[PDB]
Amino acid sequence: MRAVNWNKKEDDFSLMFWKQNIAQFWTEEEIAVSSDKNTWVQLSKEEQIAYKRVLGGLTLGDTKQGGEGMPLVLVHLENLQAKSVLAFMGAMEEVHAKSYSHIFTTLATEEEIDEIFDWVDTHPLLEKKAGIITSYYRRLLKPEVTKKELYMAMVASVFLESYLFYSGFFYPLYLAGQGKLTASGEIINLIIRDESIHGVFVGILAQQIFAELSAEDQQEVQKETQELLMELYEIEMAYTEEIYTSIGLVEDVNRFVRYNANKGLMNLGLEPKFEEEEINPIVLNGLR
Amino acid sequence: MRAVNWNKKEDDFSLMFWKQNIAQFWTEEEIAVSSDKNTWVQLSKEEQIAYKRVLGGLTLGDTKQGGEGMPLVLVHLENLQAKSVLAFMGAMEEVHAKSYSHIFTTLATEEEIDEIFDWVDTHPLLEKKAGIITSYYRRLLKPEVTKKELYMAMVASVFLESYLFYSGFFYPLYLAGQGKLTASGEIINLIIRDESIHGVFVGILAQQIFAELSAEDQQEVQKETQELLMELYEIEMAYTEEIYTSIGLVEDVNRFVRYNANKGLMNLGLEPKFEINPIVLNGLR
Numbered sequence: 129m130r131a132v133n134w135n136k137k138e139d140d141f142s143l144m145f146w147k148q149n150i151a152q153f154w155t156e157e158e159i160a161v162s163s164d165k166n167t168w169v170q171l172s173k174e175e176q177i178a179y180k181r182v183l184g185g186l187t188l189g190d191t192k193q194g195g196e197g198m199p200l201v202l203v204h205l206e207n208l209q210a211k212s213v214l215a216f217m218g219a220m221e222e223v224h225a226k227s228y229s230h231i232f233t234t235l236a237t238e239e240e241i242d243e244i245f246d247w248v249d250t251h252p253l254l255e256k257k258a259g260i261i262t263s264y265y266r267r268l269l270k271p272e273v274t275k276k277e278l279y280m281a282m283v284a285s286v287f288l289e290s291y292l293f294y295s296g297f298f299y300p301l302y303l304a305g306q307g308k309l310t311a312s313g314e315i316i317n318l319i320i321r322d323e324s325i326h327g328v329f330v331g332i333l334a335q336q337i338f339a340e341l342s343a344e345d346q347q348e349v350q351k352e353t354q355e356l357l358m359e360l361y362e363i364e365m366a367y368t369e370e371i372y373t374s375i376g377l378v379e380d381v382n383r384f385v386r387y388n389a390n391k392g393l394m395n396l397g398l399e400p401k402f403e404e405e406e407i408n409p410i411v412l413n414g415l416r
Numbered sequence: 417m418r419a420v421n422w423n424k425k426e427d428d429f430s431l432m433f434w435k436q437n438i439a440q441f442w443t444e445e446e447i448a449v450s451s452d453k454n455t456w457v458q459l460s461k462e463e464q465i466a467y468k469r470v471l472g473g474l475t476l477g478d479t480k481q482g483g484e485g486m487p488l489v490l491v492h493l494e495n496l497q498a499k500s501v502l503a504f505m506g507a508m509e510e511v512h513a514k515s516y517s518h519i520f521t522t523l524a525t526e527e528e529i530d531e532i533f534d535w536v537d538t539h540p541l542l543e544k545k546a547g548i549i550t551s552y553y554r555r556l557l558k559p560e561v562t563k564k565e566l567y568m569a570m571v572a573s574v575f576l577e578s579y580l581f582y583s584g585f586f587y588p589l590y591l592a593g594q595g596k597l598t599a600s601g602e603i604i605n606l607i608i609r610d611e612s613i614h615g616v617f618v619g620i621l622a623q624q625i626f627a628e629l630s631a632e633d634q635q636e637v638q639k640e641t642q643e644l645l646m647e648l649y650e651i652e653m654a655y656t657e658e659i660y661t662s663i664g665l666v667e668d669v670n671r672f673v674r675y676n677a678n679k680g681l682m683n684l685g686l687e688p689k690f691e692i693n694p695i696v697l698n699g700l701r
């Protein structure tokens with residue numbers, strides 16, 4: 129039985145990603161958010177509700193990535209150095225999830241926070257989104273998995289945090305770019321800095337697995353990947369309509385979703401499928 | 417589907433352990449090992465070989481804990497806050513494993529290091545040890561597991577890092593307690609500091625599951641736990657004889673194994689089953 133040996137490279141990238149993930153390590157106590165209260169109260173009830181709902185959804189995604197996605201993918205990887213990187217990434221998903229609770233403790237009462245998490249747990253589209261993604265992870269709950277199954281779980285993982293999440297990162301970035309909730313915006317930018325390299329790394333692993341497949345299996349997962357992309361896109365358009373109609377941002381959020389879907393495809397070595405638009409300039413200022 | 421909500425406690429201890437795990441965070445590059453060369457060369461060939469072999473075995477343990485044990489236990493937990501703690505622990509197991517390579521890079525040539533890892537991969541006792549432990553984890557690769565299966569995986573985890581690899585920490589601590597290889601000893605102490613709280617935490621989770629089992633299931637896992645304890649002990653006794661006879665430390669290491677087996681039992685809320693070396697104790701300072 130093999131032990132991980134870092135003095136002999138198993139690939140050309142795992143060490144670099146290990147060092148980068150460790151270098152970027154942070155926790156929620158590093159950013160004080162109390163100063164956001166002054167701009168929080170300047171928002172409308174509908175704006176506050178949208179903010180809490182999108183952060184509720186982000187918490188769900190990170191809960192599933194740290195608790196199902198990364199662990200089940202990494203268990204089936206044979207590269208021990210890449211496994212190490214995924215374990216660290218999985219830990220950071222739990223830091224991400226906890227940091228949203230750090231924001232909530234400042235911006236909401238205990239009753240209001242209970243309301244958020246109850247709404248998350250019962251929401252039909254969130255359940256549908258999460259259910260489709262985690263079904264790919266659940267297929268890995270067996271002693272031996274096929275590379276097709278492992279590839280598609282990697283695709284699901286890239287789509288979750290390079291793509292599906294951004295319907296949610298939009299609004300904290302949009303507000304931060306307008307000078308509102310900027311401390312919470314600093315936290316969201318730390319999360320995005322992590323997820324950027326999470327998606328690149330998993331996409332590299334996926335491309336390596338894809339190249340190992342038979343031609344028949346490659347054709348199957350190529351088609352399944354494109355179907356999944358557009359299945360999730362249809363659900364995300366319904367979600368954006370539900371969350372953002374009240375505050376007049378549906379089409380803006382949809383453009384951001386398409387932008388990040390193209391990024392997820394490129395992380396997988398695949399061509400863009402949506403027209404190449406510029407990032408919303410207010411969002412861009414929030415990423416600064 | 418539920419998201420983790422840290423503003424409402426799911427238990428009375430997960431936050432306490434989250435904060436402590438975080439507070440103890442460290443990486444392999446914090447301790448420079450170069451100064452150990454001066455005491456390394458003063459060891460005999462037999463002492464150097466034993467050192468490299470024990471550290472190879474420790475690496476295997478952490479490779480298995482971070483890549484199999486922690487992920488498969490955590491994926492079946494219902495408590496999302498406890499899940500979070502275990503995910504962080506699993507990440508630290510990879511820090512542990514990488515830190516042994518950091519030591520090797522200073523103390524061994526490239527060819528010698530590849531010899532170590534070849535010896536680890538083909539060693540029959542290490543294969544048997546790891547195979548017994550990871551068979552409890554492999555049982556968790558299915559969509560529905562029983563609480564007996566999850567309990568026994570937690571038992572195996574506690575035994576792995578409260579018990580079954582102290583046959584290995586003995587020698588780094590023994591040398592460090594004599595002023596030899598003290599920088600590597602500092603790394604081992606950071607690892608032990610983590611593993612102390614890993615075993616306690618998984619032991620708490622195990623006791624919580626145990627209390628939900630029927631009386632019949634409790635009887636059955638109690639028997640399996642005591643038999644596993646002694647199956648591993650027999651293998652460990654053979655391992656210590658193989659590793660330490662050349663340097664005259666078999667009986668000392670065996671005493672240390674029994675002491676830590678008792679600690680693993682206590683982490684599970686169980687009574688001790690066996691009736692510390694003072695130089696090892698000085699290496700823990």
Ligand SMILES: [Mn+2]
Nearest residue numbers: 190221224323
């Ligand atoms: Mn994340």
Ligand SMILES: [Mn+2]
Nearest residue numbers: 193289323326
């Ligand atoms: Mn991620």
Ligand SMILES: [Mn+2]
Nearest residue numbers: 478509512611
């Ligand atoms: Mn460890």
Ligand SMILES: [Mn+2]
Nearest residue numbers: 481577611614
């Ligand atoms: Mn451990």
